Amino acid sequence: QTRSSRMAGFGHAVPARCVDNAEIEASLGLEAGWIERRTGIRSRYWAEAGDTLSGLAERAGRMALEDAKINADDIALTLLATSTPDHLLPPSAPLLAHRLGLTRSGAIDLAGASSGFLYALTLADGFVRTYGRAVLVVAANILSRRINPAERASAVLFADAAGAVVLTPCPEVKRGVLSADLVADGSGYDLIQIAAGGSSQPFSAGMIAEDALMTMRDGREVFSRAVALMTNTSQRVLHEAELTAADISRFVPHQANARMSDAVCGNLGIEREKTVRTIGSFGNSSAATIPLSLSITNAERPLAGGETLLLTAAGAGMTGGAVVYRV
Template sequence: MSGVEIIGLGHFAPSRVVPNSEIENRLGLQSGWIKRRTGIEARRYAADDEALSDLAVAAGDMALKRAGFRRDDVALLLLATSTPDHLLPPSAPLVAHRLRLASAGGIDMAGACAGFIYALTLADSFVRTHGQAVLVIAANILSRRINPAERASSVLFADAAGAVLLAPSERDDAGVIGAHLAAAGAHYDLIKIPGGGSRKPFGADFDPAEALMAMPDGQSVYTKAVAMMATAATTALGKARVDVSDVNHFIPHQANARLMATVAHQIGVRPDVMRSTVDQFGNSSAATIPFTMSMAAEKTPNARGDIILMTAAGAGLSGGGAVFRS
């Protein structure tokens, strides 16, 4: 077997619904302001007793149960997250343990909004090389990293998890058939959490506000993210030798509705193949693509041979695009 197929999808969002009105009232914004500019109507926030691993386990468990796959046969868990349970140890080993993946390795991947694209690409290579299944989970609890006084991040970010179980396939042409990964470190500081790392460690004089997200120039983030996502998607299509008209499912990072529509227009994707959850679930960074893939498949299942185009960009700047044949 030299191909790769998706045999299970899963998703999870916390039960607490946060409508726009709650944020608009806090920030003194006019009613309807957030919906007009972002396309977001509501988002989900984790409960006080929920940690990142709880969301990840729920999504991963759904993917495994839907696949009916033996958990002992999963060889690797890749967890794409920017909000682990702790700075140390990594959360993936805990998630693997709670999912009863007794034979699996586990590692966190901090790729911000592009984390799932990176994890999917590496997982596909592992499955092809070793002939064993890989569970990819992307999850974030961004509600605890939002600066409540900063409009740019407050109106967008949310909490969710999505999971994809990859396994060997007898079809050589199945799996990631084209990918392009990108980084633009010159724009490293456009989205950041200033404190808590080795550059500015915790200490007696640490300002708690520096442990929150900062995005002071939202317009620059928008412009550069659109360019990176469109270029990555187009390049991935070229590597796959697939025309954009052949795409059956377009699942961009759910940054906001306006950005997604702009990227779709620039690469020429038909509006009817766009898959989106941003209106009710907001932007959960790396989780948005697998979360949306899982939810969309409940209404529009992926048929054998379908072309799925994914693209993302986020903090770092890091980004990428991938073309997956079901």
């Protein structure tokens, strides 16, 4: 009897340390306002000693569970979209479920870089509709511990955060996920990467510190590919939901870079004014950006029935996706 899913609850969490552009600009020897003019970021949050990825996910998730007024037994599945799990084994999701007291919930990690959340949303929707039970979806990242401070292009963008949504089963049609498009382009696999620690170059004694840290090979190629991926996926989910950009109530792009948000907005003819923008205070926390923005915009103005959200993201991989969601 389940025909759709609903975003029944929202949440987000950051570590407490607020890092202004001025601190980073000092470390990298750039004049004042460099970061804000080129990225739209004004400050970001970075994790501190003691802060764990699963604990950050836990705070966002608890906020979303309480927002939904859902009992913790009712969560059948927890999807944790992250690139930065506590350990390389086991995944962080079973610990997140445990910390939240979700005793009947399965749990698994999804690694889809900055696109991870949209994949998890899509797969969760298919679970809710197939099984008629609720799913908790958390995206969270502590990228700060992966930042190469000497690499200006990445050290100025990436941030730590978590966002969470509780999806519940709904009997009605023509609502929920109207369309979804998940893409990949592995020719760009090498554009955003960590060299060491996977199976191709396991972490070894005496490795170059920087080999454990993120690198962005071609910031301009990455910009072009990501804009194309977000535009093209957005475009086809709009057509499949039979909506136009003028019909979207809120546009929630991945918060990669304000200039990319602008590029996609322009390409689709979507007002900036309908576009949720959280990069100014929260930076680029990869897969976490879209659910943190959803929590923020819902906090500002509760999502009203009939509103349409366009969610889109692109990330390392390359990966990309878009979702048309009707409240």
